[PDB]
Amino acid sequence: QIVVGICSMAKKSKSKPMKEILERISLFKYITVVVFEEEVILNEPVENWPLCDCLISFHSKGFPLDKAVAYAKLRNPFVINDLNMQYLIQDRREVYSILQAEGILLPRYAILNRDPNNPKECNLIEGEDHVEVNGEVFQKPFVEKPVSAEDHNVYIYYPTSAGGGSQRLFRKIGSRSSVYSPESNVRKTGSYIYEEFMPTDGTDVKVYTVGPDYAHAEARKSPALDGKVERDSEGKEVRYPVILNAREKLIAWKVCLAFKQTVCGFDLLRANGQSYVCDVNGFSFVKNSMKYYDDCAKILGNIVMRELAPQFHIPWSI
Ligand SMILES: Nc1ncnc2c1ncn2[C@@H]1O[C@H](COP(=O)(O)OP(=O)(O)NP(=O)(O)O)[C@@H](O)[C@H]1O
Ligand SMILES: [Mg+2]
Ligand SMILES: [Mg+2]
């Protein structure tokens, strides 16, 4: 049988969507799924990791990407989500750089790099209602994102005309995804991307690809101006229906290919009659959609069969 190896932290490998999708992939007659134990990933050298013919592997906090890369070099499996690109996905500067090169619309932005080596170096000037970054003016409202994509402490600064202060976003704690601060001055230490605030209807469009020709999208309330998480009478976070237009289906095709991540999530801001990518997250599954589980598993299984059936001498059509 063709072995599909799953290599990620246990929180990811044992998540409900993963388990649901792996169940369905296992339904393919000629595929066996092997899920790598976290103790093995963390503690064993790659020479002892299980064999696989196709590798689905992805970084999250604590994951040794260096080892996954070394495993792939050692065993040369068919890789679903490219491993080296996952270093770049961790850095918002690298993400924005790739997006620009693909001709993908994104917010106007400037990178402020703080090198602690040089103290004479100053590339940001702050005024009451704007910053100047590398000589470029960003009037409030603007967004300030840590260069680390894993750092979810993204701030938004309000104009004096709106009451000033700032909204501090963070990884969702229970009932809140952000909070207002009276602080009107930008952060003094660290490197950041400053970007123009894009006016939307108050929602984010979340896109989930499974290869470049399949994209699932849904909307959620933005944490931008209000941190209170919306919850249904059951208890789940409230989501809204979305159908991607032609332009957006093309954005999805480009993002999937440009980052070499078969399974990829990214965010769109629908503003001023266009759609702007603000964030590229890499490996991401939809939660609580049976149709997504069905489609994702079928697409992945078909990708594996198409690629590997020939060398395994398995009958397979188109
Ligand atoms: N330029 C922008 N204009 C308007 N809203 C923005 C802008 N940039 C980010 N936002 C809002 O702030 C949210 C968080 O920014 P985002 O870049 O997604 O941060 P993140 O920390 O990478 N979040 P996550 O999706 O959990 O990985 C977005 O979902 C938008 O609601
Ligand atoms: Mg099977
Ligand atoms: Mg993708």
Ligand SMILES: [Mg+2]
């Ligand atoms: Mg995001």
Ligand SMILES: [Mg+2]
């Ligand atoms: Mg992100």
